[PDB]
Design a protein around this nucleic acid. Structure first.
Ligand code: ZN
Ligand code: ZN
Ligand code: ZN
Length: 89
DNA sequence: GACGCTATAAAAGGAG
DNA sequence: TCCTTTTATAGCGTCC
């Protein structure tokens, strides 16, 4: 069994290797958000959801682009940006 | 075009 | 293992 943990929701039925990931996933169904932003008090489903958000307050931009050295708050925004240097408008 | 941001999935770290 | 963190992937929505 590579992914022994299955989602209880008949409709969804997503599979996971670690039980942690299954519990975290189930939260999207129940709508429970255990991670709270201490500035605006908003709630998030994940550790990363909260971390991505704290940066909107702090203005921290950890991710730099290799080509132009421009900074971004999140990983995806940075990765997606780099692709523009490989094409025209 | 570009990118700020939220969501969510996949994986890894660390301690008992 | 269980719990904490980290990395990856998808879109949305809006301004340019
Ligand atoms: Zn599910
Ligand atoms: Zn906040
Ligand atoms: Zn760049």
């Amino acid at each position: 069994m590579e992914r022994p943990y299955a989602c209880p929701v008949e409709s969804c039925d997503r599979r996971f290797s670690q039980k942690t990931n299954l519990d975290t996933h189930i939260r999207i169904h129940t709508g429970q958000k255990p991670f709270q932003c201490r500035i605006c008090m908003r709630n998030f489903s994940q550790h990363t959801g909260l971390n991505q958000h704290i940066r909107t307050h702090t203005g921290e931009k950890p991710f730099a682009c290799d080509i132009c050295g421009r900074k971004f708050a999140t990983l995806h925004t940075r990765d997606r940006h780099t692709k523009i240097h490989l094409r025209q408008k």
